[PDB]
Design a protein around this ligand. Structure first.
Ligand SMILES: CCCCCCCCCCCCCCCCCC(=O)OC[C@H](COP(=O)([O-])OCC(O)COP(=O)([O-])OC[C@@H](COC(=O)CCCCCCCCCCCCCCCCC)OC(=O)CCCCCCCCCCCCCCCCC)OC(=O)CCCCCCCCCCCCCCCCC
Ligand SMILES: CCCCCC(=O)OC[C@H](COP(=O)([O-])OCCN)OC(=O)CCCCC
Lengths: 49, 75
């Protein structure tokens, strides 16, 4: 099941779960500089792509 | 300038937030919206309206006088 994996597989698999998906976030401590959720959410895609 | 991470000190405060794709941008827009507008106008009308009513009364009197002050009298 590993040797099947090549670069095309990770791109397809990662986009399926990561690209343009709503993440869950949890913060604890001195997190004033923790980016706002909309900024986090916009980091889940690239306008160049 | 000022940066995030150098503003102030905060302790023991938790914030729960939901993604904007999980919720509605217009929730109860008229159900809860109008009663809130009524409360907001009710709370401030007595502080804003009187001076502008006072202006309205001066405005009608002043024109009413001027509009007829140049009428003629029999003398
Ligand atoms: C009109 C002139 C248009 C100029 C466009 C400039 C394009 C550019 O710089 O490409 C970078 C940008 C890279 O963004 P990315 O791929 O998401 O990667 C983010 C970086 O890692 C870095 O991402 P980041 O997280 O560090 O920053 C996110 C950034 C990402 O967006 C930008 O960088 C846009 C740059 C400002 C353009 C100003 C528009 C006018 O968003 C902004 O901060 C811009 C907000 C602008 C607010 C202005 C309010 C008025 O590529 C493009 O968006 C090109 C597509 C544009 C389509 C052109 C139509 C033909
Ligand atoms: C000719 C095309 C110009 C494109 C400008 C652009 O997209 O700016 C970034 C944001 C949206 O991207 P993002 O903030 O989600 O970041 C995405 C991170 N991957 O868009 C806006 O809200 C900016 C408004 C500009 C008004 C002058």
């Amino acid at each position: 099941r590993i040797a099947e994996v090549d670069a095309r597989v990770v791109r397809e698999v990662c986009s399926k779960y990561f690209y343009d998906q709503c993440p869950a976030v949890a913060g604890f401590g001195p997190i004033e500089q923790l980016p706002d959720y909309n900024r986090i959410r916009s980091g889940m895609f690239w306008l160049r792509f | 300038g000022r940066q995030f991470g150098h503003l102030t000190r905060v302790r023991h405060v938790i914030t729960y937030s939901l993604s904007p794709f999980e919720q509605r941008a217009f929730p109860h827009y008229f159900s809860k919206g109008i009663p809130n507008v009524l409360r907001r106008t009710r709370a401030c009308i007595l502080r804003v309206a009187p001076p502008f009513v006072a202006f309205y009364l001066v405005y009608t009197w002043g024109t009413q006088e001027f509009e007829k002050s140049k009428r003629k009298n029999p003398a």
